[PDB]
């Protein structure tokens, strides 16, 4: 007979047919999936008196355990079974309630924001309820649904209750972001943005995904703080961090201005770096997992040698700061010294007036001042061989993979900002954000400036042709610009940067997949002109959308500080060596757009930045950012078992992909980053990768590390993030 | 190790057919001329053609001047120095003859009672007793020691082979069997506490634990209210966790469900309860503690083993002739073999207990196109194991008619007209619907009237050396691989699972099983008919789990499953390694 304990707390006969129907419902349209196999593997685990909910858990997991290269469709079977499970949990049935009835109920529960009820009328919810297509839930992969259930769907974190489904999440996000639009257009915007995100054309970041529609206003996920050379600024920086990490933001800290140990603050940088680290970890589980930062300083800082070894697990406690990452800042001259085999002079930034400023803003001024202070020997200095310093850096980069590079001249010669008024002097955690900052006197200093950026991405595998990006860019810029006015700012200098510059960072996902379906590869140069064509479309249409927005709602207060304002464009300033590795002409009318930008300006000072996506891109089953996949199948752990994901369309494209370790070297990849960088406002999270077995005695030579570094420089790469080393 | 040989000069004196005919001869020597030789022929045929598998002591000894054939003994130890010494002396005597030992020592009072020093120093003594005849204190001489889960000292005992302590609180070279019942599990489920008592402070509590579950209920809850009684309170999840944690890492902490051993048993737990098992956990017989090595009033359990080869029989009706042959042969051995300890002779002559099991079960499932893990083998197992028990019961019944029932027959549930088909865990109904094929009701009556020659007949033992002789899969275990590798003085010895050529895809190798559920359902189904118990393992592959770690939730789940389906004992836990 076999008995089942129902959802309330009573028993009944086991319904073997109802289970079979749900399985058959889930398998519809799927290939290479045995419903019979899942049935055998889950039926054997049942027992007299089993809770109904555990039957669902058992069938889901049974389907999930079969995910593979030979039968990737188990991704979708398992998913739909979970959606089915999640529906019952949330509503007590498969069919979601009517939108209004749901919104009402949730506001009363304090889980949705009450402004929704004010901003929209019942009739307007009836109309939004018709935009929705709940069957789009049938289109998630298993991993995607695990992410929704883990961290996106409005849920009770205490009792483990799920309150909504993915389409309510999407419509309501659309609603809050366009709430302030006029009735004339309000709802048509709402429909179009819902469509774009529910069909995975636009990818949304985690804080937006889990928060917008809820009573929270915390959406800033990355902040950039410059720290001046005084205790007041140090404390101010430290307080800002604590405030931001308590809201889960990732931090980018510039601390290169702090004077060296032994100067006229006797104790130097390291004790303060330690303090910033404890600042970052001040809201972490136990001082480990959670809270992250990258800290930036110039290569020529007097104390640089001590700083290069800071996460080297091989020292004494007093001269180590292991749990932050570091970004070393370099320019043309630093490299020339390496090439010429000469020396590099180390100064404390406090003994060389005007030297730090020029480093970022003016390369020839840096030239004169640098050589000057090298002749002038009343000035405190250390002389080091350029090969040794570069070697040390790369040696620490190689072993930790967590010493980064920033080319500060590229960040300013090829930038949407006038380095004279607003230079770029640092980046964020992952190295894609590149915005102006100003140090603070005090946590509440009005004259300080902390940079903020609001992110999103286009899915290159969900767009059929590049002209779709027009409608999508309008939708993405307008949505994210509305968020700027919606979200809280816990530190006044942060509100300054966001309202003054209105900076955005819209990037890409599914790039590997996109290259695959166009029959191109990373490593051989075959993708060069396609990347040029693809990334020109992206930037032209983002610039266009922000331009229409400036015409509708006025340019950004601090617009006059951009190179855009002076009629300059990315196509005018890019590293000129890109000409030698691609010949794709420009397809869009850049000259008309120049004029239209001259006249009416841009709503946002920056629009584009290529971030790593990781949690995000799972939602739409996509390759991460612009990275090649490590394998065909991605494995993850969870409380619920092994979570597997198959790269999209493996069936037809397995040989079309170029997996990470199939690349003979880094050159091909770096050429594409350079080509992308021609159009990108900010920067790109770009990695270098090395497989020991491709080398004699399994040792990666320094010569190749320095070579790939110089390559990235040659093609106008702004930043270099992770170094990944394969292991046997 | 079988052929009569000179162990000094390395000379071999016989061949395998002389071994087989002469074994047949010694076992039937006392039969009347009328039938003597026809029995001899038929048993020779059965064993020479691998239908019946014989154990090592019988294989190497019968026909020789030796009379040492007991390979497993079960000793209960009472809570006194006289009994402790008696137990210890019995062990020494038996291990000098290569027997494996099962020791019940749960009655020994806890450290700190009104024998101040507690169980562990005595456990150590039993261990040296076991190893007293071993090559150098290592290889050879083996024992499993049993005690209740609620023993006051249980926590110290659970960690006894944990290689990670001080010498004084460790007994590494014995195995342990923890004894559990319905109530112990309910505490786990309900999230409640478990109360630990010394068996000496709770009169009548130990007795009920085995014999009477509702009496245990009342006494347990009573002594929990009564706080003049020495006690420790522990959280049920923590105790089960600790046990399973030590089981997981050593694979050598066993489980015995003492209620199942008595509710579904060929013995009246009121007169002769089952309070322990043997080394490998398949034997389940009554015992009584001894005053003295030569105490006539004590009782040490003994069992004589054999097995049917399920891959050499064409159809189940062959088991009639084979069961007659196997029961009659092994029953004759009882009268033939020496008994070095009087309490052992008592159990063997009084109860005449046998343990006939199976080999080639994996192979048999393979040729019927069935598997372990999916439930596809359920009704076939039910059909196969009903044939086994019906025909063994029949053969022993004909023997009782010919030569009289066993002296202590009146102490069996059989004597009261009860049968295994009446007492089995009732959840088996939900996982198999094979009806019964043989006339059990006629046999009931025939058992009522004329009784059984033997108090038990069936027990599923691991075979290892035995089953090599006929190239067979071991006992009821799935093979680890297609090819089994062993070392010897002579080179790498390899063996291929039988009929690999035609059945390679039909097999289901051990690590191909997604989990334990399918296997445990078959053990439960087998247990419906088995008099004694089954050596059943649990198996886990780390790589089937996140971060290569086997969760406790699954360990406790599979434990409860085995309970739910009336599994009596759980032997090895095997963990795969990369």
């Amino acid at each position: 007979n076999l008995l089942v304990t129902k959802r309330d707390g009573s028993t009944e006969r086991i319904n073997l047919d109802k289970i079979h129907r749900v399985l058959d419902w889930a398998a519809e349209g799927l290939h290479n999936v045995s419903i019979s196999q899942v049935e055998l593997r889950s039926h054997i685990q049942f027992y007299d008196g089993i809770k109904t909910s555990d039957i669902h858990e058992t069938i889901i997991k049974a389907a999930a355990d079969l995910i593979s290269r030979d039968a990737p469709d188990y991704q979708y079977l398992a998913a739909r079974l979970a959606i089915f499970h999640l529906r019952k949990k949330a509503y007590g049935q498969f069919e979601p309630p009517a939108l209004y009835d749901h919104v009402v109920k949730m506001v009363e529960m304090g889980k949705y924001d009450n402004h929704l009820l004010e901003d929209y009328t019942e009739e307007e919810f009836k109309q939004m309820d018709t935009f929705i297509d709940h069957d789009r839930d049938m289109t998630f992969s298993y991993a995607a649904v695990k992410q929704l259930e883990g961290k996106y769907l409005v849920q009770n974190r205490v009792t483990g209750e799920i309150y909504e489904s993915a389409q309510f999440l999407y419509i309501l996000v659309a609603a809050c972001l366009f709430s302030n639009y006029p009735r004339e257009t309000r709802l048509q915007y709402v429909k179009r943005f819902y469509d774009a995100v529910s069909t995975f054309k636009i990818s949304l970041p985690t804080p937006i995904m889990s928060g917008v529609r809820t009573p929270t206003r915390q959406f800033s996920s990355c902040v950039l703080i410059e720290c001046g050379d005084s205790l007041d600024s140090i404390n101010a920086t430290s307080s800002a961090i604590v405030k931001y990490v308590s809201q889960r933001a990732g931090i980018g800290i510039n601390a290169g201005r702090i004077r060296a140990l032994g100067s006229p603050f006797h104790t130097g940088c390291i004790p303060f770096y330690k303090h910033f680290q404890t600042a970052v970890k001040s809201c972490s589980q136990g001082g480990v997992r959670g809270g992250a930062a990258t800290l930036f300083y110039p290569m020529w800082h007097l104390e640089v040698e001590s700083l290069l070894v800071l996460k080297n697990n091989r020292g004494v406690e007093g001269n180590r700061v292991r749990h932050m990452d570091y970004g070393v800042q370099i320019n043309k001259l630093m490299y020339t010294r390496l090439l010429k085999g000469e020396d590099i002079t180390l100064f404390s930034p406090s003994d060389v007036p005007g030297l730090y400023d020029a480093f970022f803003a003016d390369q020839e001024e840096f030239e004169r001042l640098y050589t000057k202070y090298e002749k002038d020997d009343s000035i405190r200095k250390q002389r080091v061989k350029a090969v040794e310093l570069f070697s040390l850096m790369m040696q620490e980069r190689a072993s930790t993979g967590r010493i980064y590079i920033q080319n500060v001249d590229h960040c300013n010669t090829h930038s949407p900002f006038d380095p004279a008024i607003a230079p770029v002097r640092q980046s964020n955690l992952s190295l894609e954000i590149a915005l102006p900052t100003k140090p603070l006197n005090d946590v509440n200093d009005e004259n300080g400036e902390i940079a903020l950026c609001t992110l999103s991405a286009f899915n290159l595998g969900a767009i059929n042709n590049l002209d779709e990006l027009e409608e999508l860019a309008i939708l993405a810029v307008r949505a994210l610009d509305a968020l700027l006015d919606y979200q809280d700012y816990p530190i006044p200098a942060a509100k300054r940067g966001a309202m003054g510059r209105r900076t955005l960072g819209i990037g890409v996902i599914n790039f590997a997949y996109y290259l695959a379906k166009h029959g191109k590869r990373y490593s051989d140069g075959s993708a060069n002109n396609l990347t040029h064509k693809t990334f020109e479309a992206i930037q032209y249409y983002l610039l266009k959308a922000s331009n229409e927005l400036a015409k509708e709602q006025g340019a950004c207060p601090w617009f006059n500080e951009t190179t855009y304002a002076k009629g300059i464009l990315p196509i005018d300033t890019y590293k000129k060596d890109l000409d030698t590795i691609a010949n794709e002409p420009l397809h869009y009318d850049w000259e008309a757009l120049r004029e239209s930008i001259k006249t009416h300006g841009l709503r946002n000072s920056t629009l584009s930045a290529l971030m790593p996506s990781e949690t995000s891109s799972q939602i739409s089953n996509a390759t991460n950012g612009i990275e090649p996949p490590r394998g065909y199948v991605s494995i993850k752990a969870s409380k619920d078992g092994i979570l597997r994901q198959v790269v999209p369309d493996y069936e037809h494209l397995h040989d079309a992909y170029e997996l990470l370790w199939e690349m003979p070297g880094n050159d091909g990849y770096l050429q594409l980053v350079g080509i992308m960088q021609k159009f990108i406002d900010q920067s790109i999270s770009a990695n270098t990768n090395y497989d020991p077995s491709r080398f004699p005695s399994g040792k990666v030579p320094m010569q190749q590390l320095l070579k790939d570094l110089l390559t990235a420089y040659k093609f106008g790469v702004k930043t270099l993030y992770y170094q990944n080393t394969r292991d046997g | 190790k079988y052929l009569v040989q000179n162990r000094v000069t390395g000379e071999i004196y016989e061949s395998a057919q002389f071994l087989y005919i002469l074994v047949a001869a010694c076992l039937f020597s006392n039969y009347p001329r009328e039938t003597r030789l026809q029995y001899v022929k038929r048993f020779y045929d059965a064993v020479s053609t691998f239908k019946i598998s014989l154990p090592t002591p019988i294989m190497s000894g019968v026909r020789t001047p030796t009379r040492q054939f007991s390979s497993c003994v079960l000793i209960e130890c009472g809570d006194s120095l006289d009994s402790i010494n008696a137990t210890s002396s019995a062990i020494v005597k038996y291990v000098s003859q290569r027997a494996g030992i099962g020791i019940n020592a749960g009655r020994i009072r806890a450290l700190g009672s009104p024998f101040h020093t507690g169980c562990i120093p005595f456990y150590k003594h039993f261990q040296t007793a076991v190893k007293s005849c071993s090559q150098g204190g290592v290889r050879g001489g083996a024992a499993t020691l049993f005690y209740p889960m609620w023993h006051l000292e249980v926590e110290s005992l659970l960690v006894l082979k944990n290689n990670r302590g001080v010498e004084g609180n460790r007994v590494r070279h014995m195995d342990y069997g923890v004894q559990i019942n319905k109530l112990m599990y309910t505490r786990l489920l309900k999230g409640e506490d478990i109360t630990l008592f010394s068996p000496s402070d709770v009169p009548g509590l130990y007795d009920a634990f085995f014999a009477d579950q509702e009496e245990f209920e009342r006494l347990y809850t009573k002594y929990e209210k009564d706080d003049s009684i020495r006690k420790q309170r522990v959280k049920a999840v923590e105790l089960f966790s600790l046990m399973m944690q030590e089981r997981a890492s050593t694979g050598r902490i066993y489980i015995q469900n003492v209620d199942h051993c008595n509710t579904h048993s060929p013995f009246d737990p009121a007169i002769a309860p089952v309070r322990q098992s043997n080394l490998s956990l398949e034997i389940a017989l009554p015992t009584k503690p001894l005053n003295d090595v030569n105490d006539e009033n004590g009782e040490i359990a003994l069992c004589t083993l054999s097995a049917f080869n399920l891959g050499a029989i064409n159809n189940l009706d062959e088991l009639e002739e084979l069961a007659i042959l196997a029961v009659r042969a092994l029953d004759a051995l009882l009268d033939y073999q020496d008994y070095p300890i009087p309490a052992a002779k008592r159990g063997a002559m009084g109860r005449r207990t046998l343990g006939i099991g199976v080999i080639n079960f994996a192979y048999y499932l393979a040729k019927h196109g069935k598997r372990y893990s999916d439930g596809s083998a359920n009704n076939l197992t039910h059909k196969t194991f009903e044939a086994i028990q019906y025909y063994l019961l029949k053969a022993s019944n004909e023997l009782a008619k010919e030569q009289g029932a066993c002296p202590w027959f009146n102490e069996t549930t059989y004597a009261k007209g009860i049968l295994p088909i009446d007492t089995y865990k009732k959840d088996l109904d939900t996982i198999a619907n094979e009806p019964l094929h043989y006339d059990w009701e006629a046999l009931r009556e025939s058992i009522k009237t004329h009784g059984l020659r033997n108090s038990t007949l069936s027990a599923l033992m691991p075979s290892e050396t035995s089953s090599q002789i006929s190239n067979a899969t071991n006992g009821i275990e799935p093979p680890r691989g297609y090819v089994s590798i062993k070392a010897s003085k002579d080179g790498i010895l390899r063996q291929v699972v039988p009929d690999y050529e035609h059945l390679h895809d039909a097999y289901e190798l051990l690590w191909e099983m997604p989990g334990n559920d399918g296997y445990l359902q078959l053990v439960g189904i087998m247990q419906k008919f088995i008099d004694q118990s089954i050596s059943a393992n649990t198996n886990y592959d780390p790589s089937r789990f996140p971060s290569g770690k086997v969760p406790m939730q699954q360990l406790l789940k599979d434990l409860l499953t085995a309970y739910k389906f009336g599994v009596k004992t759980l032997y090895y836990q095997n963990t795969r390694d990369g």
Binding site: - | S547, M552, Q553, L560
Partner: peptide, 16 residues
């Protein structure tokens, strides 16, 4: 090595 994943609610359902 093993994980001490002990969920008392999950267990409590089982019928012995």
């Amino acid at each position: 090595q093993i994980d001490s994943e002990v969920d008392t609610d999950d267990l409590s359902n089982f019928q012995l």
